[PDB]
């Protein structure tokens, strides 16, 4: 049931999140996942507030409720992390 629930939603894509120090963490998300969950996980692993960071896709700000589908993201796409302005 859980397995059939998962596959209806499709596959995970694997994104690479590149930090200010050029370190890298990959995240798997589904195409309809809100990226706030990625932003929060990344911030949590870096020890900093989420709102101290801005997350860009091809230079565009990623909103909390953006999804990979909305952004046109694909397997192996990159998210860049910068300090909030």
């Amino acid at each position: 049931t859980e397995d059939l629930g998962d596959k209806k939603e499709g596959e995970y894509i694997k994104l690479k999140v590149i930090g200010q120090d050029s370190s890298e963490i990959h995240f798997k998300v589904k195409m309809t996942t809100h990226l706030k969950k990625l932003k929060e996980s990344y911030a949590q692993r870096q020890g900093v507030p989420m709102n101290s960071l801005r997350f860009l896709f091809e230079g565009q700000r990623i909103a909390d409720n953006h999804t990979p589908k909305e952004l046109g993201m694909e397997e192996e796409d990159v998210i860049e992390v910068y300090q909030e302005q």
Binding site: I25, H26, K37
Partner: peptide, 20 residues
């Protein structure tokens, strides 16, 4: 530095090899 893959579960985030 070792490879790091985090699964955003939304849903079992344990297995980062997963694709569904």
């Amino acid at each position: 530095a070792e490879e790091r893959v985090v699964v955003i579960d939304d849903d079992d985030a344990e297995n980062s090899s997963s694709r569904y």
